[PDB]
Coordinates of C-alpha atoms in Angstrom, one line a residue:
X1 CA 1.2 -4.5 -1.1
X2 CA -0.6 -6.6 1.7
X3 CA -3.5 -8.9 2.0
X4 CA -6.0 -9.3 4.2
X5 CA -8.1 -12.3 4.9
X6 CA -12.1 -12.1 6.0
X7 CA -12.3 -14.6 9.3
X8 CA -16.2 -15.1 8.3
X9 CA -15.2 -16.2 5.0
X10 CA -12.1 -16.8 3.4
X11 CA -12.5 -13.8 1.0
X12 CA -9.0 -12.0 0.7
X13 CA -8.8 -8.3 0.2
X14 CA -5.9 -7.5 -2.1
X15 CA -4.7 -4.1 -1.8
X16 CA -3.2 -4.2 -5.3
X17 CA -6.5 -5.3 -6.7
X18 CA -8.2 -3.2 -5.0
X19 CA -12.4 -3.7 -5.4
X20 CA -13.5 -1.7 -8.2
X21 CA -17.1 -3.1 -8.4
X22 CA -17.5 -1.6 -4.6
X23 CA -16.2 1.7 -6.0
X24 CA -12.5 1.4 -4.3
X25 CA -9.4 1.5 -6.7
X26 CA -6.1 -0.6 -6.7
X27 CA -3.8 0.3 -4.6
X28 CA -5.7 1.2 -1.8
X29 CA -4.7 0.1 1.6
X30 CA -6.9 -1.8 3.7
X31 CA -6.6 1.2 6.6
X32 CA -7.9 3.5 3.6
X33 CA -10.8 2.1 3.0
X34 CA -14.2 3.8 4.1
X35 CA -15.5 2.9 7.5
X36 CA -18.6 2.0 5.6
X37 CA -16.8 -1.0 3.5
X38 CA -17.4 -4.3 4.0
X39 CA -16.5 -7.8 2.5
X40 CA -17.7 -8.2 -0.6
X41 CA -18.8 -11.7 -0.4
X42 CA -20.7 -11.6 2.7
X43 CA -21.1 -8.6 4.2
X44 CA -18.8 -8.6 7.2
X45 CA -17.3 -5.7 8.5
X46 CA -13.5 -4.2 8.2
X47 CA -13.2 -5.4 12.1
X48 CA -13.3 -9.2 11.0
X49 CA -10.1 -8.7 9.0
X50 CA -6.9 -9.8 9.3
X51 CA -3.5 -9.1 7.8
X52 CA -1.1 -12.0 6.4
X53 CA 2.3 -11.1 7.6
X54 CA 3.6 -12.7 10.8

């Protein structure tokens, strides 16, 4: 599935590791998360991320 990176930091959201610890499972898609979710690592919200494909 795809990746995502965080512009404020560097984290990358995985959408086949999912982020348990923030109660979402793998295999969610980035567009499926809540509007509520943000980076785990620094708090950013979904609008600073962007997907790795060209």
């Amino acid at each position: 599935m795809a990746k995502w990176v965080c512009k404020i930091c560097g984290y990358i959201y995985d959408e086949d590791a999912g982020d348990p610890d923030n109660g979402i499972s793998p295999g969610t898609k980035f567009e499926e998360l809540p509007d509520d979710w943000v980076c785990p690592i620094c708090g950013a919200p979904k609008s600073e991320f962007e997907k790795l494909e060209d």
